[PDB]
């Protein structure tokens, strides 16, 4: 499947794409404002994620650091990134269907739209000013708004027992972005698309 990743933010982001144990395509790339990066993702990919990283410094060899979303210091992400990261998540060709969602479960750093470019389903978006409005205890100094599990490491926020409810913190993400997951057991905002759809991820869609 084809993903076009578009940086509509006025600032540079470093896009990342991974399925947790492997890069998707090149795994990451700098996107200046307006730049678009087209990647190919193998059919059947389960548990892929795309995210933006902010304020990265890399050297010749692709090693460095980002203030949000860093994936072990690599330009080309092999693993997932450090919160806070707004997440585009997808599982492709699962019994004939693609499944996509946006998640604030690992916090929020950049606004995002995640839409099909082919027919038969709708897109989802989380484009509210979650960083500006972020509760004081969840603000990340690097930028971004952490989720409560990252910050506090409790069974309730991390849903470690498989039982947990919404919290003051999850409701904040949910109030600003109803179409994104706000905690592990949120009512699913997953969208079902035809198998083998293609997609566009736009950072800062309303910029």
UniProtKB/Swiss-Prot annotation:
Family statement drawn from the similarity comment of this UniProt entry: Belongs to the thaumatin family.
UniProt cross-references to Pfam families, sorted A to Z: Thaumatin
Top-level taxon in the UniProt lineage: Eukaryota
Keyword Signal belongs to the record: yes
GO CC annotations, alphabetized: cytoplasmic vesicle
PROSITE patterns: THAUMATIN_1, THAUMATIN_2
Subcellular location: Cytoplasmic vesicle
Main location: cytoplasm
Keywords: Cytoplasmic vesicle, Disulfide bond, Signal, Taste-modifying protein
Designated name of the protein: Thaumatin I
Stretches assigned to coiled coil: none
Lipid biosynthesis is among the record's keywords: no
Phylogenetic classification of the source organism: Eukaryota, Viridiplantae, Streptophyta, Embryophyta, Tracheophyta
Described function: Taste-modifying protein; intensely sweet-tasting. It is 100000 times sweeter than sucrose on a molar basis.
Disulfide bonds: 9-204, 56-66, 71-77, 121-193, 126-177, 134-145, 149-158, 159-164
Matches recorded under InterPro entries: Osmotin/thaumatin-like_sf, Thaumatin, Thaumatin_CS
